[PDB]
Amino acid sequence: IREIEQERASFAFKVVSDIKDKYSQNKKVQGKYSSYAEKAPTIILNNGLGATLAFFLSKLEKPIDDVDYKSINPESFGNAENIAYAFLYKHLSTWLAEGNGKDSAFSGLTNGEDPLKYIMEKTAIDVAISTEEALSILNWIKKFAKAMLEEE
Amino acid sequence: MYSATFTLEAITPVFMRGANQSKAEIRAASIKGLMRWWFRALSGSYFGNDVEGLRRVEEYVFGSTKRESRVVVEVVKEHVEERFCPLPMVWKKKKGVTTRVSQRAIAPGSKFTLLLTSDDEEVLKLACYSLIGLVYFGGIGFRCSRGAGSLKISSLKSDVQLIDLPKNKNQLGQMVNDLTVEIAKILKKTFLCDHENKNCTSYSSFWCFYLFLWGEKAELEEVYYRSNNLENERLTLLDLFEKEFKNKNNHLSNYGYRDFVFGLPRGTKKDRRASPIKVGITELSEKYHVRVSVFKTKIFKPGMNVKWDNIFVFLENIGAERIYP
Amino acid sequence: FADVISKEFLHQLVKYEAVRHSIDKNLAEEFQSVFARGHQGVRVELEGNDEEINKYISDGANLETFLDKYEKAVDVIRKQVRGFLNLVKILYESIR
Amino acid sequence: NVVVKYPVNSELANYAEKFWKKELAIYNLSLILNKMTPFVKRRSESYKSSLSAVKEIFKNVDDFQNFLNSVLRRSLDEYRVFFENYERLFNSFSSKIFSMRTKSRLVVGLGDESVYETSIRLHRNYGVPYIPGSALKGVAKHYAFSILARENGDEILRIYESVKEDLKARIAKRDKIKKNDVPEDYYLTAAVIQELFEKKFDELGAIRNTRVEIGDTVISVGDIVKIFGTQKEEGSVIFFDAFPTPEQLKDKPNLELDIMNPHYQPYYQHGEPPGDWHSPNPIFFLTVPAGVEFTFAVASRDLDDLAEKAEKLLKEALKKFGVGAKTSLGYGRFDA
Amino acid sequence: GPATDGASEHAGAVSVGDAKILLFPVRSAKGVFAFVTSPIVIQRLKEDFELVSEIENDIELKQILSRFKVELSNNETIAGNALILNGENKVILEDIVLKVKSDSNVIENLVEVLKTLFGDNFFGKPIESIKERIAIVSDDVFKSFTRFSTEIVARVRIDAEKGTVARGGLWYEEFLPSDTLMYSLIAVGSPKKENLPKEVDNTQKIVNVLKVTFNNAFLQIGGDETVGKGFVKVRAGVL
Amino acid sequence: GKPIESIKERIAIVSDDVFKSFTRFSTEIVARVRIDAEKGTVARGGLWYEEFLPSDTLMYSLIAVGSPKKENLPKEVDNTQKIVNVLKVTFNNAFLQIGGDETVGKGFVKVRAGV
RNA sequence: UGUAGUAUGCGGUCCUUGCGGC
């Protein structure tokens, strides 16, 4: 009886604490991350999950169809907006592709494939379930970001 | 809710465009941004290099990302016409012809009004002063700094006391001084900002600004460029000004008119530092003159320094009278 | 959240909820402090026949460290918060 | 010279590219705009999915506007039957209906989050611009607030010195220190008036006898609070959404583009000196052009007189206050 | 039934039912928007018809829909000619390319059932004018449409102190999309009161009164009444 | 009223604890209120949550029939077999309402006697 | 069991020259 809600909460707490600790000095980075987190579900519901991920990648000045989440470093960007976008993309894609971990209750809907490349050549039902999971995890992430992270 | 209305007439064709580049039309947003720039220019004299105070007062007056604008600007009536008009200093590369390039632009005169409304007298006065300074010493739209945006106040109607229009050259001469002193008085009385006085501003401002006048014409149709050939004997006032500017013997610049004290896109094919030289048309007692405004800022552009007094030599080449100071 | 809350992020989650549901930040801080204090002392009815937890709760001690050493901390804290919320609801309905 | 990509699933990107190349005919504007958003890569190595970069796939701005308006016009019959049913719903209640043309450009919903970063309120089924009833109610309430503050500012400030002191203390708490500066300008009066109308409605009982002249009629504070309602009492005037008349969509375009060119953007955001070395960052956004005619309707639940008063207030607000976005620049203004 | 101030006197003579969805408005590439249905939807409609037949002891109407069995893959649909793409046997419903399954009896029977239930006028437009804008999709696809294609409306509160959105003054609301169809059952028995007037003596005198008083009317459902949300056209029908 | 073959594809069997948690927390929790027309808002103290058993739920019951009471019963239902037969015939494919909230379309179930 | 509308109050706003030079 291991509810996925516990995994969602643990992963969201871990990622928000990670960004808080790594960028405790950069208040503007925290504000940008919080704003992007609480605005992402609207973008996903409007234009879809793949469009949202491609929008994040474009804001990262990175090419699409040739970039996965494992090969991006969120801290390797000078701009605060790029920092926050990279962190949000990494967190969302990590939850979608691996979950809280291999040994955890939730291991991610995608086995290990990049969520964008997964969305490119999968059925509508799979991308719908992925969108639902992304909505839930983004809700938890926004909750925790509003909890700890400072507001821009 | 004090409000002011300014009915303005386009002395020269105005190249103001919206999203559709092929269509020219008057935009409230562009005018508001230009008034923001001109208010910065006038307030730089009082605020000097203290950019923080200027930013705070501008956010107080024109609004920022955390407060709605304290002054709202609208364009109410547009008795304007759109036609074709040659570009100020652009020549077509057509074989043999080598004539000008004519874009769609607002026709001369083109009566229209601007309404500025606020809830406080001081901020409305600041906005009105910025707008009148813009109209008198600046242009609007594309190629404003090349005599294509000059506007005269056809009529004014304000419930707040303002500065009267000029009649002669000296009136426009000391209007700079009285506008600056009134702006400083408002800044000191209302917001109590001082910012001391360090040196000349990094941006274009009135700390180091000069105004000159040249030429004299009685017909509006004999001012803007008419001839399609520079060598033609029939040249209007602005055509003669352009011909003198293009002459190598005019100024002492090593590259001539292709120097770097003017706008950045000259030879280097890079940067966007606008030309501190601004050309316009000034009407005084039904007499038209070419007005030249220069903003000799301390730093021309971060990473590039150009000599300043060389441009004054051009003023000596044409013998333009120094209206201010 | 009673069926999902864990010890590590209880304080931050309750802080978020207080800030969201408080007109004043002082009210949210007071609610956070009073909830954190009150939810500590609540007797639990574990599935296993264990009374040491209740003995630790009754006395007032390093009970937090004992739960850190304990292997059923998550169930204990979930039952504690659920019981405290039930007591709060009962008392509020009593008032009104 | 531009590379177009589609982050939608495969076997659908082909149809999206066919729609954007005008090879096929799409009929829903919201569908092509949102669910089939293209990512355009110019010489710069970045797939910017913004209207400024989206328009690069067309010949010019005019072609983009023509394509959008043709897609909008392809559903004219369905929009006509929808508007007929909407008018029938209007007439079902004792609703007063008035038509107003757009004096200037109008844009509602510009702040909505989207891939383009500049959205627009389009009806989901038919893809036509419209004004939500919430926006009309809010603009009417704020016009009433502004009228009350301009007319009865000092009076309400004196009557509610406790409330104005509470608001000043709150502002001091949030807005930096500002211990007692807190200027008693018109904005503070508007804020305390809104606070009275929102959380302190009952204390507004004494003020209810006041009257303010709107247009040609006179409206009481009690009338306004009855119209809009409180946390404990529901409003009595139903504000319906506004939709353009289907007839005008046949001839003149119902959607055009507008540009914002933020020079000195680092000066505004980061703090660099303005100067002129501040190459602009143009951003385009959709907006319904001026002259487009909209139909508004306000219904009553208790008294038709309240409906007439609300109609007059809304007409005055749309004439002066303006609805939509960028109202400080004269956008979203209506004329008789 | 009696008001809240007193309930032991008698019970209500009417019993409304849950407004189960029948057609969902989904955006389409051709046929600007389409009315969508699912096999579970029509199965529940058949169950509702069976319940009506059992209540009225009228088996004749029981088999009206009993001639419609369907089974669709997740990438197949039975759509009208308007929605079908020209030169390509495929349809697009707001996010998905679906191959057009070939079948006519099911859609014809559904149109006939709707016509019998709600007459020849389908809420301001003829019913035959929308028979080519109906799509029957897979169950998961219909669930995804009903969960993700609903209206999401963002609203803010503007404070007069600054003219900007207040601190935490923004919120999102979920709305059923416009032009959607919900069917409900309203069962009626003998009134439970005593000494009834002759005009409402029997159940049919309640049936006709309800039908005449709630035919082609307009009602407000849910919240946001003051801002013009939740307004619905109601049509009452009998078998 | 549905083909049993389609049901086979959507049958799952879970653990005991999982089934208990499902049956405890997957029911329909519906919040209801009462609105007064005088003010148009919810009446004070009128909000409450009611729990409803989900639709499309299969349940089974056992009816134990014994020897009919000796009260000069007709020979048609004289034996136990006859009475169980008549009960099954008269209750097969029936529709009946159980529980409260009958006035709001809650409780209607379909009974299919086991033959 | 019977009677019972998750409803009322809330503006997707605020901030930005279609320019720079021949």
B154: left (phi over 0), alpha (psi -120 to 50) or beta: alpha
Residue A124 at interface with chain F, using a CB cutoff of 8 Å:
no
C-alpha–C-alpha distance, residues D76 and D254, integer Å = 12
Which residues of chain F come before a gap where C and the next N are over 2.5 Å apart? Answer: none
In the block, which residue shows the tokens 């003010």?
A: F39
Segment holding D238, helix H or strand E: strand D237-239
- SS3 state of residue E183: strand
Domains parsed from chain A with CATH numbers:
1-149 (1.10.520.30)
Using a CB-CB cut-off of 8 Å, the residues of chain E touching D167 are 161
Q: Which residue of F has its CA nearest to A2?
A: F18
CB B28 within 8 A of CB B74: yes
| Lookup: tokens for D153 | 């500012």
In the block, which residue shows the tokens 């006197």?
A: E9
DSSP state of B115: E
CB D298 within 8 A of CB D240: yes
C-alpha–C-alpha distance, residues E153 and D109, integer Å = 10
* D140-CA/G11-C1' distance, Å: 9
C-alpha–C-alpha distance, residues D262 and E12, integer Å = 66
Which of the residues D110, D328, D333 would you substitute to probe the B interface, choosing the one with the greatest number of B C-beta atoms within 10 Å? D328
Q: How far B46 CA sits from the closest chain E CA (Å)?
A: 27
Chains D and B touch (3+ CB pairs under 8 A): yes
Chains A and D touch (3+ CB pairs under 8 A): yes
C-alpha–C-alpha distance, residues B221 and B233, integer Å = 16
Residue A86, classified by CB atoms within 10 Å of its CB into exposed (0-12), middle (13-18) or buried (19+), is buried
Q: How far F46 CA sits from the closest chain D CA (Å)?
A: 15
D114: left (phi over 0), alpha (psi -120 to 50) or beta: beta
* D135-CA/G9-C1' distance, Å: 15
* C-alpha distance from residue B168 to each of B217, B241, B283 (Å): 15, 22, 9
Chain A neighbours, 3+ Cβ pairs < 8 A: C, D, E, F
Residue D19 at interface with chain E, using a CB cutoff of 8 Å:
yes
Task: Please name the nucleotide lying closest to B142, CA to C1'.
Answer: G19
C-alpha–C-alpha distance, residues A138 and C89, integer Å = 30
Q: How far A113 CA sits from the closest chain F CA (Å)?
A: 28
C-alpha–C-alpha distance, residues A115 and A130, integer Å = 9
**Helix B237-246 and helix B309-318, axial crossing angle in degrees, nearest 10:** 130
Q: What is the CA radius of gyration of chain A?
A: 14
CA atoms within 13 A on the CB side of D142: 22
CB D195 within 8 A of CB D163: yes
Contact D330 B28 (CB under 8 A): yes
* D196-CA/G12-C1' distance, Å: 24
Q: Which residue of A has its CA nearest to D4?
A: A64
| Lookup: tokens for E208 | 């006709």
**Alpha-carbon dihedral of residues E107, E112, E117, E122, nearest 10 degrees?**
80
Using a CB-CB cut-off of 8 Å, the residues of chain E touching D82 are 179
Nearest to E223 by CA among F40, D108, D232, D82: F40
A residues 1-40 lying closer than 8 A (beta carbon) to F:
1
E residues 16-35 lying closer than 8 A (beta carbon) to D:
25, 27-33
Nearest to D196 by CA among D205, D209, D187: D205
- SS3 state of residue E179: coil
Nearest to B203 by CA among B46, B38, B58, B44: B44
Cα D128 off chain centre by: 14
Nearest to A80 by CA among A33, A118, A130, A121: A33
- SS3 state of residue E79: strand
Structure solved using which method? cryo-EM
- Show Cβ contacts of residue E88 under 8 Å, excluding neighbours closer than 6 positions: none
Using a CB-CB cut-off of 8 Å, the residues of chain D touching E162 are 187
Q: How far F43 CA sits from the closest chain D CA (Å)?
A: 10
C-alpha–C-alpha distance, residues D81 and D126, integer Å = 11
Q: What is the 3-state secondary structure (H, E, C) of E36-67?
A: EECHHHHHHHHHHHHHHHHHHCCHHHCCCCCC
Using a CB-CB cut-off of 8 Å, the residues of chain D touching E76 are none
C-alpha–C-alpha distance, residues A55 and A60, integer Å = 9
DSSP string, B78-114: E---EEEEEEEEEE---TTT--EEEEEEEPSEEEEEE
Protein-covered nucleotides on strand G (Cβ within 7 A): 1-22
CB D127 within 8 A of CB E32: yes
C-alpha–C-alpha distance, residues B56 and D212, integer Å = 36
Give the resolution value in Å.
3.1
Domain ranges of chain B: 1-198, 199-325
Q: Which residue of D has its CA nearest to B271?
A: D277
Nearest to D50 by CA among D99, D119, D111: D119
* C-alpha distance from residue C84 to each of A9, C2, C53, C67, D52 (Å): 21, 11, 16, 18, 56
Contact E55 F95 (CB under 8 A): yes
CB B145 within 8 A of CB B129: no
In the block, which residue shows the tokens 């409000």?
A: B3
* B305-CA/G22-C1' distance, Å: 22
Residue D306 pairs in a beta bridge with: none
Give the angle B84-B89-B95 at the CA atoms, nearest 5°.
80
| Lookup: tokens for A38 | 């609480």
Contact A131 E95 (CB under 8 A): no
Give the angle D101-D103-D107 at the CA atoms, nearest 5°.
90
CB A33 within 8 A of CB A59: no
C-alpha–C-alpha distance, residues B237 and B243, integer Å = 10
Q: How far F19 CA sits from the closest chain A CA (Å)?
A: 10
CB B73 within 8 A of CB B116: yes
| Lookup: tokens for D192 | 């305390």
* C-alpha distance from residue B300 to each of B251, B264, B324 (Å): 19, 10, 21
Q: For residue D132, say if its preceding peptide bond is cis, omega within 30 degrees of 0.
A: no
Residue D239 pairs in a beta bridge with: D298
Task: Please name the nucleotide lying closest to D282, CA to C1'.
Answer: G18
DSSP state of B166: P
Give the angle C77-C78-C80 at the CA atoms, nearest 5°.
60
* E218-CA/G9-C1' distance, Å: 25
Contact B273 D185 (CB under 8 A): no
C-alpha–C-alpha distance, residues C80 and C93, integer Å = 20
Sheet of B209-217: strand order equals B278-284, B287-295, B209-217, B321-324
CB D51 within 8 A of CB D285: yes
Residue D202 at interface with chain F, using a CB cutoff of 8 Å:
no
C-alpha–C-alpha distance, residues D218 and C61, integer Å = 70
